Design a protein around this ligand. Structure first.
Ligand SMILES: O=C(NC(=O)C1CCCCC1)N[C@@H]1O[C@H](CO)[C@@H](O)[C@H](O)[C@H]1O
Ligand SMILES: O=C(NC(=O)C1CCCCC1)N[C@@H]1O[C@H](CO)[C@@H](O)[C@H](O)[C@H]1O
Ligand SMILES: *Cc1c(COP(=O)(O)O)cnc(C)c1O
Ligand SMILES: *Cc1c(COP(=O)(O)O)cnc(C)c1O
Lengths: 810, 810
């Protein structure tokens, strides 16, 4: 149908049709008489998978022959979403499969909806890893993603009586056609035990063994015939485990629980033993795999020339002492040489400055679970602090500030400090964030080793986040500037010459309207909710957190409602306000925020005086597949975190690429987005980081704002009195109390500027032509935010490898 | 190479080779450079599996169109063994695959050794179910095997320091190419809860739900293009299960433990809750499946005309009250009609008379787990006892003897009584056993309903137990009488005309020698044990039990050793005595017997005076695949249970078919085997059932035998004094004490006759020609013991269906 979706050649369509029929018969053991839509999805998935195989085998044999430096991306999270459409896009098979299935009497888009998301992540950090895998394959890097194959990913969110309910994400129930189990490459992982000192160094003995079984998933590059590997480890008990008899077999579950479930707590570091086990599990299995592959090329001097390990946050930080353990205890290298190798091999990426998210493991846990690693950490700390003492003689407080060991009621290990000490590079994820790291959190470390500190502004893949989710926009762009922009997003700048093009303006606006109509129909079919497609689609989708200030959005919504009730016969620009995202199960305030949003909806959506001028909808079960639907439909992107709290954001970039304008604070990547597009083409409001600092020095007093802003007072009085909860008047007392007395994120301080800025948004939306022209200026300058740019920078500035856009033979 | 293994046509070999290469590439994601023998096994398995698919789909659609009466075989055990060779045999693909793999530079026999046994059974009962599935498919019956997909089958047995050690049988580790998961046909199963009485009958409410997910395995008939289904249920938790969050997900294991492991206790009924859950799980899921299939043909009068349910022992006995529950509570049938339907549908097979094996469930367990079923059982009992009272007025003790409810310290439900009451047919498994049932255990029930009681003598499949495991013997037979005997074993009688044929005599003896050489080489390669291939191979393989009297064999072995030490320079016929089998993990005496056997070996095998005249070997990890190796190699089959204890035996039949002579008591099927072959062609010894009864009336005094038999005294003195355990002199005190004071199975009483009979065996073995002629007389009369004969009898006399040898279109 459309050009960017590839060719539908007669021979390809015929071949796809026969292979579809073959899989339905031989693989699924079905015939057309008893086959369901799910059977048809699986027949297509297996057919497309076949096309990956040849390329996958020859890519890996290519790396064996050429022996390039290998990049190992270690993450506890890979938020992959669905695989079928992405594979077709990268293999140029979309139009051919569309035609093949059509000729078989099937609708491919209907089959695509059957696939379960691989929801092996919480949010931004996990999705970043996924975009990175796509870009590394597209740039021809010999890259491997290493993680855990969780049996249960992020929970499915149900809304019942306005409250979040959690249900297990049984994503493997119907099988996973994309993965290949590799039980032959199973490796042992050790836990507990004790350290024995012999004449020839330390020995870790009397351990419990858990097996790590790898499952490999293909990661195709964009039309370059490169297929890389994501290897995820699954926990298995050894066969002699606990070997009355029946109970011993049943107790195997205890070992295998390591890979059972993704921790969904993304707000507050939880020092749980099972989580530590997960972190060591991935690290120990991965490092054995790396070393095996390195030896199959005695001399570890060349190790850093052939291996780069990227630590996604501190979650895989145990890689540092584990590598030291292997080099010193097993390979018999001297400490100093082992340390040189380790530092040159490892690099660390930080994703937040919020103190409650930082991993600080109790020493007593490490002592019991990983006794040798604790000893190694102590030795690292001692040698590091000796360097600090030599650099800053007499500065005793610096020594206590920089220590990997934190003193207190319970002694803890600061994993971020461990990462900085043991890495040759430390990066933040947006310019403002990287600057904050050097000025505040890691100031002491920056003063000691300035050369270690870098910035790598985040990005998103334009394959999933434009071509896949918004083919209409991709096509109208391709018509003007060709197809090269899909792997070279900077080419979108050429669209600036079309800002006064009447045809292009009409086409951009048409694509947005089509997307809005499609999503409006999706909501009715799947959730039975009615919306006006002509209204401004006002969207905030992301995990629920106080720092992200969904509460500030809530206050604006109530303001609009109150203004309508005050002057009912006055014209206002119609809005559909959509808020979605999951709350960590143990995060009470975040769960209260979800209840508030639904409670506002219950009042607003049923007020006859409002009509269709204002609708408030909570988008249930926000996840990658839902993001692909809602983002292309959005007019306004809400990026309203307190200045200095959102390290980067990546949702912001997805919205920019897909034709929404942004209302935001000068926080994270918003700063660079506004710099690229021009401040006049962004809706910037609120305190800057420096303003937040000034308010902190004086002391934040929320009462002041309540006393001075009558419209704000009204809302708080409504919340307190039970206007949004008639049958339970004190339901929102916790929210009111927090806002009035202990708001870390200064919601009231940005309220007035936010409301005024929102008025400027509505004013522009009244002028469709000028709205669309500003949209064009945003899309045209979104190029910097391709993860291809991000990965090229990691490659050149951290990993010491050159990216390649050259094709492998088909 | 050989005729019975089929044709190796040019087109078939070419096609198999290309499909092998296709699976290696696309299915396994390997190339010839990195592929291991296991990869090659899997490529072949997938290739052969493809040939099953068309036949499997068209067999099941054939049953849908013709709508014949369906046979449902319910068993907690299916002891299947390996599937690859059996599939090739039944599809006539063995020679073609042999040629195809040879041309690829691979040895097919080496690839066959890689497959894990499906060890989903303990012994005879489980293996009977497996032979039955093969025969039902061969006889064209619309039959379904229903069971549990255990994650762990029967434990792997290791011998360490002469003691049995248990290791988990992780048979699914590398995947199972034969099964097809059918998550779409998942069904709920209910547990616990309570019974509510409404105006419209009883309701079972507040239950916990476990899901039953089916996996289907193909069961091919012998060259008739019929492929039936074995459906095994796997336990799954619902997604809202226990839905802090993390623990709720981890607790899903509790529900899923139902299908985790096969209970290995085959001696003593263990009233464990988990076992009861397993039994209801299979019953509840299966009956829903049966009813669904029946409705997809309102009127349950025709139910018994379209459905037969065979209960393999009392393990699935809950089918009776479950069927009543569904008919009465859900379908709203009146009790009397529901009961008529239930009785006409169900039939029950008994496998033992030993009281300790009988299922007697505590009422308190059923009350908590299955409250509605208990109520139904009580009502069944009341109505049944009303019939007994009317038939035998005033006979109050009969009422207490026949009750389904047993009074005592703890009230119990006798599941065997439940089965008799609710079945239209009750059978034993050999003529003598069926007679014992009517005369003793179930005498009262026989007097009330004589028409219910039948005999169905057991059998074995000649596909697995001749063609597969002994192709050399199958071929020399085929040369003389053609190939028809493989599906019509009675044709073996034609071999009686070759008993004086010099060529045939030589060929039979040659095949045995080849088999013995092959097995002697297997022992050296895999276990590093040296044996003389010219010795008499004396074999007892079966589960370790006191009733099977491995101890009697042990006494004979020591007798031979002592006789050699007394007269070292006297000639004796050389023997290799092989004993193998697993002991139930909690069966102390059986574990002591294994230790005794190895201890005897340690003395005998290292005595220089003995030389190679006597060897005692314990065969480790006895299982279906090992049986296929050892049985064809055997000269003498030990079938030496106390008369009246072994219901049938089936190992006995396997040995007869494969050219071993039998030393045995007149017990179980041995009686019919001797009747078929002629008593002069069997080595019969010992007490008959009537002799055992006479000894019980007088009182068994083991001391009498010890006092009167000097050779027996010597052995007991050797055991007691520590001759077979120098470093631990009292090791075997438990064995001696049992033999002397509380031997339920009268080992000493058969000792003298056993030893004398063994002398007659050695005498015949000295004359190779006459030994072989007697062997021919055994093989020629083994026809009755085909499971094809057994199944034809079940079909005609119990199920009311006619077997068919007609081919389905290919
Ligand atoms: O997603 C994040 N943490 C988590 O999901 C949890 C933190 C606490 C431990 C569990 C993961 N962090 C996110 O990383 C993104 C990628 O750099 C950034 O764009 C966001 O600004 C940042 O909040
Ligand atoms: O194998 C048997 N029970 C078991 O394995 C256990 C009994 C106790 C509960 C668990 C199964 N029983 C066997 O059945 C065979 C087939 O009819 C007969 O040939 C044997 O004579 C009989 O012992
Ligand atoms: C992009 C994405 C995120 C990250 O969004 P932010 O607004 O940057 O936090 C979270 N969840 C999903 C499913 C995403 O796709
Ligand atoms: C046939 C068989 C049995 C049954 O043998 P009996 O001697 O009849 O008890 C037990 N185990 C296996 C593996 C078998 O093949």
């Amino acid at each position: 149908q459309i050009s960017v979706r590839g060719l539908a050649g007669v021979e390809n369509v015929t071949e796809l049709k026969k292979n579809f029929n073959r899989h339905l018969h031989f693989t699924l053991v079905k015939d057309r008489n008893v086959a369901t839509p799910r059977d048809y999805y699986f027949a297509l998935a297996h057919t497309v998978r076949d096309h990956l195989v040849g390329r996958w085998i020859r890519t890996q044999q290519h790396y064996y022959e050429k022996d390039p430096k290998r990049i190992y991306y270690l993450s506890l999270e890979f938020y992959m979403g669905r695989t079928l459409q992405n594979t077709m896009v990268n293999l140029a098979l979309e139009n051919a499969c569309d035609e093949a299935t059509y000729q078989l009497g099937l609708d491919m888009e209907e089959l695509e909806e059957i696939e379960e998301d691989a929801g092996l992540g919480n949010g931004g950090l996990g999705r970043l890893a996924a975009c990175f895998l796509d870009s590394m394959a597209t740039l021809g890097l010999a890259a491997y993603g290493y993680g855990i194959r969780y049996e249960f990913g992020i929970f499915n969110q149900k809304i019942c009586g306005g409250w979040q309910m959690e249900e297990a994400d049984d994503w493997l129930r119907y099988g996973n056609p994309w993965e290949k189990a590799r039980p032959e490459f199973t490796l042992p992982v050790h836990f507990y035990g004790r350290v024995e000192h012999t004449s020839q160094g330390a020995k870790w003995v009397d351990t419990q063994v858990v097996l790590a079984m790898p499952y490999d998933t293909p990661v195709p590059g964009y039309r370059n015939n490169v297929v890389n590997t994501m290897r995820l480890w699954s926990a298995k008990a050894p066969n002699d485990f606990n070997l009355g008899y029946i109970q011993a077999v049943l107790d195997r579950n205890l070992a295998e629980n390591i890979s059972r479930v993704l921790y969904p707590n993304d707000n507050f570091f939880e020092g749980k033993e099972l989580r530590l086990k997960q972190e060591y599990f991935v690290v120990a299995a991965t490092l054995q795999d790396i070393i095996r592959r390195f030896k199959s090329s005695t001399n570890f001097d060349a190790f850093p020339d052939k291996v780069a390990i990227q630590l996604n946050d501190t979650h895989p930080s145990l890689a540092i002492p584990e590598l030291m353990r292997v080099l010193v205890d097993l390979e018999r290298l001297d400490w100093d040489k082992a340390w040189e190798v380790t530092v040159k091999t490892c690099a660390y990426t930080n994703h937040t400055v919020l103190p409650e998210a930082l991993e600080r493991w109790p020493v007593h846990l490490l002592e019991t679970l990983l006794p040798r690693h604790l000893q190694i950490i102590y030795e690292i700390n001692q040698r590091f602090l000796n360097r600090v003492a030599a650099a800053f003689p007499g500065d005793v407080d610096r020594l206590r500030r920089m220590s990997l060991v934190e003193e207190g009621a319970v002694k803890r290990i600061n994993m971020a400090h461990l990462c900085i000490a043991g890495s040759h590079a430390v990066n933040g994820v947006a310019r403002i964030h990287s600057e904050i790291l050097k000025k505040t959190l890691f100031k002491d470390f920056y003063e000691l080793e300035p050369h270690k500190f870098q910035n790598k502004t985040n990005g998103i893949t334009p394959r999933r986040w434009l071509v896949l989710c918004n083919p209409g926009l991709a096509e109208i762009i391709a018509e003007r500037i060709g197809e090269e922009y899909i792997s070279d997003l900077d080419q979108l700048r050429k669209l600036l010459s079309y800002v006064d093009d009447e045809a292009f303006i009409r086409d951009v606006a048409k694509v947005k309207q089509e997307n809005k109509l499609k999503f409006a129909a999706y909501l009715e079919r799947e959730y039975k909710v009615h919306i006006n497609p002509n209204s401004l689609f006002d969207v905030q989708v992301k995990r629920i957190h106080e720092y992200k200030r969904q509460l500030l959005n809530c206050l604006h919504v109530i303001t609009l409602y109150n203004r309508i009730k005050k002057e009912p016969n006055k014209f206002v620009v119609p809005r559909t306000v959509m808020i979605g995202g999951k709350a960590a199960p143990g995060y009470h305030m975040a769960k209260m925020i979800i209840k508030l949003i639904t409670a506002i909806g219950d009042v607003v959506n049923h007020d006859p005086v409002v009509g269709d001028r204002l609708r408030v909808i909570f988008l249930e079960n926000y996840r990658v597949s839902l993001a692909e639907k809602v983002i292309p439909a959005a007019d306004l992107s809400e990026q309203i975190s307190t200045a200095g709290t959102e390290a980067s954001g990546t949702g912001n970039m997805k919205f920019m690429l897909n034709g929404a304008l942004t209302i935001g604070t000068m926080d994270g990547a918003n700063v660079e987005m506004a710099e690229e597009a021009g401040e006049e083409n962004f809706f910037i409001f609120g305190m800057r980081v420096e303003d937040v600092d000034r308010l902190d020095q004086r002391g934040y007093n929320a009462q002041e704002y309540y006393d001075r802003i009558p419209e704000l007072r009204q809302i708080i009085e409504q919340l307190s009195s039970g206007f949004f909860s008639p049958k339970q008047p004190d339901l929102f007392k916790d929210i009111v109390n927090m806002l009035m007395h202990h708001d870390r994120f200064k919601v009231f301080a940005d309220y007035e500027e936010y409301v005024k800025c929102q008025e400027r948004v509505s004013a522009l939306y009244k002028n469709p032509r000028e709205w669309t022209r500003m949209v064009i200026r945003n899309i045209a300058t979104s190029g910097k935010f391709s993860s291809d740019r991000t990965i090229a920078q990691y490659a050149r500035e951290i990993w010491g490898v050159e990216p390649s856009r050259q094709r492998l033979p088909a």
